[PDB]
């Protein structure tokens, strides 16, 4: 019921590298913290890390075990909180992480090869950050990403993008 530094420490120690990396990506609009413990502490200091906010973050990185063990909440409670309050993480960020999860290293390599004209071991989220820095992708600017996903024959992910666009 109360936020403390104990909860932040538990959460930070339980997440692995990929979950931490994604959590940093999902919070880029509420920002740039170098690690997750600093990110959560800054969010707490600004009054944006109540139990519900942290539960939303754990729900987005799909650590339901941490939801149940640390915050004593279940799936339906987090979904209620989300359907009742404004979201800390936008649908755009959730969509970008989802696309990243459905891509393997060969897919990301092929995607990078096609997009280098318009702009290693880098993940999809790193590429999205780099493209945002070049103003080549944005919540209202997805045609280039959609075209590149189509050209590497990932029509399913293009469809996820089209569902997002029809959602706005």
């Amino acid at each position: 019921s109360h936020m403390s530094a104990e909860v932040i420490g538990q959460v930070e120690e339980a997440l692995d590298t990929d979950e931490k990396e994604m959590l940093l990506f999902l919070c880029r609009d509420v920002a740039v913290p170098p690690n997750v413990r600093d990110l959560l502490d800054i969010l707490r200091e600004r009054g944006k890390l109540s139990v519900g906010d942290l539960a939303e973050l754990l729900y987005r990185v799909r650590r339901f075990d941490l939801l149940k063990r640390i915050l004593k909440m279940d799936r339906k409670a987090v979904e209620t909180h989300l359907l009742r309050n404004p979201h800390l993480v936008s649908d755009y960020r959730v969509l970008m992480a989802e696309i990243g999860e459905d891509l393997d290293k060969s897919d990301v390599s092929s995607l990078i090869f096609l997009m280098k004209d318009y702009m290693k071991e880098k993940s999809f989220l790193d590429l999205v950050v780099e493209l945002e820095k070049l103003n080549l992708v944005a919540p209202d600017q997805l045609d280039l990403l959609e075209k590149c996903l189509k050209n590497i024959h990932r029509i399913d992910l293009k469809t996820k993008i089209q569902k997002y666009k029809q959602s706005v």
Partner: protein, 182 residues
């Protein structure tokens, strides 16, 4: 209807030869680099899902594949589709996703026996290299090689006709029926 379970069951009924046929019939949608690691039907299905050519609300390409390799048992058992329906569906213009050229080639491969296969390989000894004419090559792989050397294509049937005419005339019947339909 459990969709993934149903796809898994269908895959359990398909062996490596049926899989080779399915991959050949999918050549115009799954290129060679992605064909190479496909070693069971589920992997094939996954590629088709990524192109949105296979989902619970869209079974048409899977049904066409199973029909073209004569797995009517699977059509009836797992997809509740009879031979007549498929025929109707695939005769409506614009509904078939496997080209008549590809189907024709597959059907030729259905009619060539082992001895005729060796005679076929002998007939091609001047256009294909010997490593690609080895004893461990079936007719579909030979067709893929001929396509790679542009001695076989939708508008280049001369060498195919010349070789088949020295083997059996039913092959020529298949080719000519295809030609008259196009």
């Amino acid at each position: 209807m459990d969709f993934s379970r149903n796809l898994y069951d269908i895959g359990e009924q398909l062996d490596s030869e049926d899989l080779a046929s399915l991959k050949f019939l999918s050549l115009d949608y799954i290129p060679q680099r992605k064909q190479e690691p496909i070693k069971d039907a589920l992997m094939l299905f996954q590629r088709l899902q990524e192109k949105r050519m296979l989902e619970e609300s869209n079974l048409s390409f899977l049904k066409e594949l199973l029909f073209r390799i004569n797995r009517l048992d699977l059509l009836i058992t797992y997809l509740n589709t009879r031979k007549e329906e498929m025929e109707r569906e695939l005769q409506t213009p614009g509904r078939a996703q496997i080209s008549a050229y590809r189907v024709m080639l597959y059907q030729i491969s259905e009619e060539v026996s082992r001895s005729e296969l060796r005679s076929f390989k002998g007939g091609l000894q001047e256009e294909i290299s010997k490593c690609k004419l080895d004893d461990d090559m079936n007719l579909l792989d030979i067709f893929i090689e001929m396509e790679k050397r542009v001695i076989l294509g939708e508008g280049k049937l001369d060498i195919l006709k010349r070789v088949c005419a020295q083997i059996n005339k039913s092959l020529l019947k298949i080719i000519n029926d295809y030609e008259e339909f196009s």
